[PDB]
Amino acid sequence: MHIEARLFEILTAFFALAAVVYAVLTAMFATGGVEWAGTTALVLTTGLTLITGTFFRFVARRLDTRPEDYEDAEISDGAGELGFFAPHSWWPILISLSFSTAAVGAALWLPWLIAAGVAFVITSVCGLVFEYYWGPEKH
Amino acid sequence: SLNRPNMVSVGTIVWLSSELMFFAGLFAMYFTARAQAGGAWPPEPTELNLALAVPVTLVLIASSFTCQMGVFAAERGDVFGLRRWYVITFLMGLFFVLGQGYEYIHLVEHGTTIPGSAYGSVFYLATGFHGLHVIGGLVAFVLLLARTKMSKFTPAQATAAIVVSYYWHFVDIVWIALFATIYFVR
Amino acid sequence: HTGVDVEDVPSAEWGWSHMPIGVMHIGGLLSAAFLLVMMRGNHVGHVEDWFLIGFAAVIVALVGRNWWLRRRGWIR
Amino acid sequence: VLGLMGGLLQINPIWNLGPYKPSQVSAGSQPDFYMMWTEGLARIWPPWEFYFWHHTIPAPVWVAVIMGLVFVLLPAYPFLEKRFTGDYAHHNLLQRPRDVPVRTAIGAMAIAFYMVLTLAAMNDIIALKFHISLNATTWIGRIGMVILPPFVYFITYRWCIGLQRSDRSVLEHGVETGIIKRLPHGAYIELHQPLGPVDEHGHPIPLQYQGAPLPKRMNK
Amino acid sequence: MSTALTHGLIGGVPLVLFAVLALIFLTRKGPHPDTYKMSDPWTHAPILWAAEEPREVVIGGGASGKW
Amino acid sequence: ELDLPYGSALTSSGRISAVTEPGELSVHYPFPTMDLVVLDDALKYGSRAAKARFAVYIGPLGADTAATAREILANVPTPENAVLLAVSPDQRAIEVVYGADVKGRGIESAAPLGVSAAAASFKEGNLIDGLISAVRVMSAGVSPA
Amino acid sequence: ELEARRPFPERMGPKGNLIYKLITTTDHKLIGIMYCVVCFAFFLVGGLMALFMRTELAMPGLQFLSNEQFNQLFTMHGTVMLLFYATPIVFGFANLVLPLQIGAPDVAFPRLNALSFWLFLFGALIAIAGFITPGGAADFGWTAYSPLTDAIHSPGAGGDLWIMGLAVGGLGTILGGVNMITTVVCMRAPGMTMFRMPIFTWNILVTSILVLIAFPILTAALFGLAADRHLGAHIYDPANGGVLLWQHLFWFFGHPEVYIIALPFFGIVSEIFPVFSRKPIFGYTTLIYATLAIAALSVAVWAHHMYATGAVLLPFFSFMTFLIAVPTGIKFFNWIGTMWKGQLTFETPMLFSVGFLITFLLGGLSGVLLASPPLDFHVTDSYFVIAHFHYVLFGTIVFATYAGIYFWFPKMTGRLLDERLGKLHFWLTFIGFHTTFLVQHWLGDEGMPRRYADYLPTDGFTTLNVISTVGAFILGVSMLPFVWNVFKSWRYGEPVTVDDPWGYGNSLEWATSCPPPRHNFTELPRIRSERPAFELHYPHMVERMRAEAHVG
Ligand code: HEA
Ligand code: HEA
Ligand SMILES: [Cu+2]
Ligand SMILES: [Cu+2]
Known part of the structure; x- marks a missing residue:
């Protein structure tokens, strides 16, 4: 995982340089000094790219080449068993409906509807999470 | 085939970056309207109680270490040490939440409200x-503990533990930043 | 049962699975007629008459399309 | 449960009202929820009256007629259905709702009609809390009462048939496990799990439906 | 200016342009081959069509004809 | 091993991966689409009602016509339960072939009816229509068992 | 010897085949089809709003609309067209063809995929359902500026629904971006390195990164605005820097958005050109570097939308936009070099790509003209800006979306769209667009600001509004050929029994069955370059490809 980390590090370098340049050039030459909004936004954009690139570097420096990282690789190299991929599920639409109920209750200021929407969100997220872990009914 | 870098880990890290942008x-928002308030910018009916804000910060910092002990226990596949350390972390997070709420009550009793001033607005909207x-993190802890109770312990369960772990770590670091910005720098 | 195919409805031999098509056709026609009559004694305003005629025309168009395609052999 | 909710929730606080008097009124209406469909019918029915020689037939006669027609059609359904379907046998085993699509769609249509009539009874509360016009709510109920039930019927029919087809797929192949392989020549397979015997080629032998539910998750 | 002119242009120019473009484009010939006439010889490759509907070499009869 | 006509390739499996030029088609049946769809629907709904496959062949029979038709029937998926109709417009010849399982279900009374309908509609020059008429008559004749 | 086929493939499918599958599905192909259909419905709604606006704008005087109604109309038109059609059509195309292009069987998180789709749908419905309020829908601008959106001014309930619907849709978009980044990083064939993957995949990766940068800050700003409107929260109070705080936050979100809806369509035309030129893509690594540079620069120009406020540092942002203008030109030159000296055939996707080229060139020229602060000082907030962003937006999303639909319809359905109807559709669209949006430059050059519901006869600009309305009605009538074509060709229409019905295709999606199976692949070829399907279908060409590649 070298190219991904390198991409994020290039982005981090540019964002950090732009952040510091803007901060200084607004500290001077500007009406009321530092702008305090674009500065914060650029600083934490740099932080975003930095977090991601750092995680990718740290997982890459303790890894050996994968078949997709390796030219001259054959398809027989990737033979095996991939992970688990969820087939059919109806829980996402219920989660969406719960969030929509909460959002309507927040738009029209209705605390009872907000509370009902939050309870529905909790219930449907629990349903989503426990879907492939419930055991058989113990009778 | 096995594509050794974990997938849920990557997804969680990138979502945490997005949440950083939200903050x-x-x-x-907070840093604007401080450059406008001239002189004593935190208005006079506003006085911050440092005798309550430092203890809860210490409790959250200790939550971080208990959660790391939990994930250490998770990586060697025994569920009971995991459950113990995560119950401890849940209790400490609940203590932090209750302390924050009590400080809110005391601050509203004789002073700052959201519609009162601009300082109260930025303060309450930021904290x-x-x-x-934090409440979301607590709910996540509860759900993970129930899932570990309801089936056999596997590497997928260990991965869930790890990703909840560094979500909690992200929350703690964000609190450190907010606390240092609001109470000390002023 | 009066009859559908197990290639259309897998569980056709386990329960009621067929309703005649004339019932649905005349029901759509009667619903259109009711929507049209529902503006008798028009109280002041006409924005709702446009919704009435719109829905009536849509229902009639659906029924007519189904009838035409069943008549020319493109259905069943 | 009844004690908890009779202690913790306030219902019918008659003192906030007063004694009944023929001259006073309030924006309050809407009888208990099991009588709300009659109120909604009275609210959304159009004013059709008849005047002939020194006589009068007002509009609520329609409400009374529809109420009595429902009260008559409810106890007659078993006999109507046996006459229509021509099925006069004895039955001790139940049906799954997905296997009787026409009756399931009839019931869904009736529930949709009931729900429209029940929502039309709270016109004023809905218009006040959710910012909609009162005339708009009246017309919305009046048009929904005729256009929503057949839509629900159509959707329910297709939905039951889709559930049947899902059952048939699970009977033909195995339970889907969610695990993917790569098959060194570059093919992706899904690793089904059979519920019965397999052939010499490994593919499971298809089974017959028997009116019972089929497992869809490997963990169950 | 000249309400009649405005409405006439706005209502009529699109339809005239549509008509002329349709007459230009939809009157051409598609890639679908022409229908085979029985007067001409059968030049296409052999054709075999089946039903596929009934799902899971001893002849049982036959019949012949010469039109 | 074969020609692989300029775009086809044999893959890691036995499947061939062909291509088409950007403007051309990949079917080339010299009949209208609304003729092919009516033939397909007749062919499907006759088979579903008679519980036997129905097949149609239009290529040549430049030999003993019955023998060629019976050799052709071997390429139908389940040839024991199947009814095949072969037509040669070059030789103006019609043949119908049966299967072992489809026998005694009403077939011998239906093959000459189908041949007659096909010939009658070929006498005008309507190949696809004659095929449709013949298949309709034969499938209405046969019975499931 | 012989093979048993059918006279015609099955038209529709059995009864009960779609509704439950639609509620329970977790596969990206069906999810992308749903994306496309719903996005086009929303496109039709927005176009109806635009037609009402044009009809009122002709013929000075208020003939049938009101001021409030016209304001609601342009607000909701902009909102729908930008956030309910383009941003979700991006992820529609992504879900359609990204796993097939990297050689994967699935996306990383298939249930998060469906969650994103349903969140989009319900958020859009919540935001649109403000028209049924007695006050009406939101009637401030699409930008929703600083003090006009409080509760004193604009007190209705439409703006609240607007805010909450935008928040829900933004959450859906964020989840989609996370899914796409993870899918590109983890799931990938055992020979496909990152510099062998297609430019469309590169562009989707970059666009997802931009999404994750841009949308959370919009969510934060919208929650602040809701706090103001529902609790009196002093946050955008002009007694503080509340007027410019909103503009800074909103435009920091909003420019990365207009780049989020451009790069995947650059990628689409980059996939389409080589196939119909029978040549390799010119400057592969150069296009990748240009995409990366555009992405990096796109987050540092936001305040060129704030020149006329007197509160921004003009030279910094002006230089940054002048800078960002260059990689787009590099990309244009690569696209030209791709077609240069080929064997060109002009089917519908190629025709639409060339139309994109022309329209986007003119739009980008007007934009680079717009980037000069002294020129913006006059032409800002006028119809010149409207003409500019309509040229760029139409050229990219409309033309590249049509090109991609015509390109990938066989791959997703197994049928071919008609070509004569497609040519009629293209020429109607071209003539209508250039008739409706060309005279607006002059229209705004002589003083006519945007968002004007009414004007006077003694003013100029009355014939040009008539001409623009004629063009808008042509654009409105241009959709019937396309809708009829899709509706007919889904069920009837020429079947495809081969892979790659457009010969000389690349990118590993033309190396599988035309309607791909579940899990997308029954075998894979050896991956040696960025044209694996080309090297698979033409093996007598690999030598001649490696030999004469660096001539120039
Ligand atoms: C996809 C949409 C899209 C795209 C791609 C662009 C592309 C560009 N835009 Fe535009 N813009 C919008 C959508 C878009 N814009 C929208 C929606 C608004 C207003 C929204 C609202 O207010 O409601 C807007 C407003 C806007 C403004 C403010 C106008 C105003 O409000 O007063 C400015 C000014 O800086 C600007 C500049 C640019 C520049 C420099 C580019 C560059 O990317 C273009 C450069 C590309 C070219 C094609 C150059 C060609 C290159 C070569 C071939 C070499 C040529 C050599 C030279 C001439 C240098 N845009
Ligand atoms: C992708 C974005 C996008 C797209 C595709 C369009 C498409 C069009 N736009 Fe829009 N427009 C914007 C984005 C877009 N616009 C934005 C961001 C603004 C600024 C918003 C602001 O001011 O806040 C704007 C503003 C704007 C104005 C200025 C309004 C005002 O400021 O006064 C005008 C008027 O000339 C206009 C015209 C058009 C026309 C004629 C089309 C044509 O291309 C579309 C015509 C299409 C059709 C007519 C569809 C066909 C309709 C049917 C067939 C009816 C069927 C009905 C149903 C199915 C429901 N647009
Ligand atoms: Cu811009
Ligand atoms: Cu402006």
């Missing part, structure tokens, strides 16, 4: 969303 928006993120 960037909140921080810009209450962090409180909501």
